[PDB]
Structure 1
Amino acid sequence: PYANQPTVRITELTDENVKFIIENTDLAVANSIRRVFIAEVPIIAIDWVQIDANSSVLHDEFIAHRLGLIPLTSDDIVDKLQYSRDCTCEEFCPECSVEFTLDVRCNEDQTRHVTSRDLISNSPRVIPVTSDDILIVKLRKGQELRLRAYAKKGFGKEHAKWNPTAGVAFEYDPDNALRHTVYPKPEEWPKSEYSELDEDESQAPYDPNGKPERFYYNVESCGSLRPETIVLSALSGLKKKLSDLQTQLSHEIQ
């Protein structure tokens, strides 16, 4: 009638992705954890682009949209930052946003590449993660791009710019022991990288008493957060959501 005792095993940990296995858990918790990786981990991404001068070939909304998609280093600052909608200010004070400034004038005849290197932050902890650098726009001789933009805390549910993951691989039952999928010709299907069968089998023998468990993860970070930070913030956020729901339920019952 109570919680499982989930067990973690980290298989691989790089600076761009983390691979790990969770055993002793129901499918729903693992799926919700993957869902929270994708859509509920808050990061800092550019919003509120104010353009002072844009004589580039790309129109203003195009440049603003490209700026929004630049990932920003938000490893340790995002937790203590606040959502701008909740802050008590003109919507931009240092406690809920990070100012950015871009001012590029192409004077030389050669094509000038406006990269993420040219984005100057007012806070050193928040920079573009590439600082090759992400190309924003190419400028001709005599063209200018000059703007200022801020970066607010949001999560991927609101807009995909705040999604920290560059693809979350998720798997369970690599040998199809539970037969949650039914291969018409199981011999034709390649073995998963976590499969434990020999090269004469195609599926594990069917298990009627089986239950999903030993969920394999591979969380690749876009760069704005370390992958371990993505997973820890994800679990913290899901726990926070459930605790807030318990608070509201207790108020309703009372």
Structure 2
Amino acid sequence: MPYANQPTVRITELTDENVKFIIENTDLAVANSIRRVFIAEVPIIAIDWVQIDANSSVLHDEFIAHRLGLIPLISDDIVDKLQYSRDCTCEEFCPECSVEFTLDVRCNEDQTRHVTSRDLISNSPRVIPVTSRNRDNDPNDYVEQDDILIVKLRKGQELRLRAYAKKGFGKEHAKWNPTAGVAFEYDPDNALRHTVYPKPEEWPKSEYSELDEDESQAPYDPNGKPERFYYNVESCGSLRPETIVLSALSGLKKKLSDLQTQLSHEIQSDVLTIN
């Protein structure tokens, strides 16, 4: 339609972790809905079935199962071709809808052993390993760098289990969050008066509020509308930041186009003559 503006983007900054950008000339409802997709709708792989062969550790089993689900997983190369479990024709699991992990550790040593993310092995090809320590010429590598201490073991304890990771999205459980956090900010100088400051001098100025380097603090304009939203998406590490954004928009496109097909389905099946 003629009244659609088609927005604008600017990437301010990009790292292996963060992606920080500005969206301009669009609606808040778009900005807010797109921020919500970054959390909930972007799909990923995380452990979903844990089968415990032997567990002599001082942590109870369901605790091991909890810590273990929550650990992060690379998915970028494979999260797309993977299908959803319920949709897949197979009974239980298969190579085509899930990937398998195996963990086997025993404390035969006199010193306390730690159980870590590297000790967890993918029966699936090393296309989808755990996040830490793989093709890592990584300056983030410090001391142990176990990514997670699944448990500690004293001389005699042992741990054997199987796990099946599956594709799903954050609306269903928090283990599937593809974000470390999501900053969102709009109209930093409070031109539009969406908040009303009592004694405005008592508030600090963000890094976006510099435009009024002065201390005049918030010049008013009532003919304005919300424009130019600032973002900073931050990667949990399990999916690189730009891929989070591109997959979010596509998923949102997929969800919208589908609602259009059902709305079409109303005009095709049960001919739209009710109203």
SS of residue in 1 equivalent to 2:150: strand
Structure 1, residues 176-212: CA drift from partner, whole Å, max 9, x if none? 1111011112111111111134454353311111111
- The 3 A distance-change label for structure 1 pair 194 and 129 is farther
Q: Distance in 1 between matches of 2:158 and 2:61?
A: 12
Q: Is 83-92 or 214-223 further displaced after alignment?
A: 83-92
Q: Is 130-139 or 94-103 further displaced after alignment?
A: 130-139
Structure 1 unmatched ranges of 5 or more = none
Q: Distance in 1 between matches of 2:97 and 2:189?
A: 48
1:8-157 equivalent positions in 2, closer than 5 A: 8-131=9-132, 132-157=146-171
Q: Distance in 2 between matches of 1:141 and 1:210?
A: 69
- The 3 A distance-change label for structure 1 pair 113 and 127 is farther
- Could you tell me how far 1:15 is from its partner in structure 2? 0.6
- The 3 A distance-change label for structure 1 pair 182 and 202 is farther
Confirm whether residue 199 of structure 1 aligns to residue 213 of structure 2.
yes
- The 3 A distance-change label for structure 1 pair 20 and 139 is same
Structure 1, residues 82-132: CA drift from partner, whole Å, max 9, x if none? 111111112311111110000011110111100111110123445454424
SS of residue in 2 equivalent to 1:117: coil
- Could you tell me how far 1:252 is from its partner in structure 2? 1.1
Structure 2 unmatched ranges of 5 or more = 133-145, 269-275
Q: Distance in 1 between matches of 2:96 and 2:183?
A: 34
Q: In the alignment, is the contact (CA less than 8 A) between 1:116 and 1:128 conserved in 2?
A: no
Q: Distance in 1 between matches of 2:215 and 2:130?
A: 45
Q: In the alignment, is the contact (CA less than 8 A) between 2:64 and 2:150 conserved in 1?
A: yes
- Could you tell me how far 1:152 is from its partner in structure 2? 0.3
Q: In the alignment, is the contact (CA less than 8 A) between 2:74 and 2:131 conserved in 1?
A: no
Structure 1, residues 18-42: CA drift from partner, whole Å, max 9, x if none? 0000001100001111000011100
SS of residue in 2 equivalent to 1:135: coil
Structure 1, residues 116-149: CA drift from partner, whole Å, max 9, x if none? 1111012344545442421110111100010000
- The 3 A distance-change label for structure 1 pair 22 and 199 is closer
- The 3 A distance-change label for structure 1 pair 129 and 20 is farther
- Could you tell me how far 1:162 is from its partner in structure 2? 0.4
Q: Distance in 2 between matches of 1:99 and 1:72?
A: 12
Q: In the alignment, is the contact (CA less than 8 A) between 2:78 and 2:128 conserved in 1?
A: no
Q: In the alignment, is the contact (CA less than 8 A) between 2:115 and 2:152 conserved in 1?
A: yes
Q: In the alignment, is the contact (CA less than 8 A) between 1:16 and 1:220 conserved in 2?
A: yes
List structure 1 segments (4+ residues) > 2 angstroms apart after TM superposition: 1-4, 123-133, 196-204
Q: Distance in 2 between matches of 1:60 and 1:143?
A: 13
Q: In the alignment, is the contact (CA less than 8 A) between 1:37 and 1:165 conserved in 2?
A: yes
Q: In the alignment, is the contact (CA less than 8 A) between 1:186 and 1:202 conserved in 2?
A: no
- Could you tell me how far 1:233 is from its partner in structure 2? 0.4
Number of residue equivalences: 254
Q: Which has the larger radius of gyration?
A: 2
Q: Distance in 2 between matches of 1:102 and 1:251?
A: 48
What is the aligned-residue RMSD (CA, Å)?
1.4
1:200-239 equivalent positions in 2, closer than 5 A: 200-201=214-215, 203-239=217-253
Q: Distance in 2 between matches of 1:248 and 1:136?
A: 45
Q: In the alignment, is the contact (CA less than 8 A) between 1:9 and 1:22 conserved in 2?
A: yes
- The 3 A distance-change label for structure 1 pair 66 and 14 is same
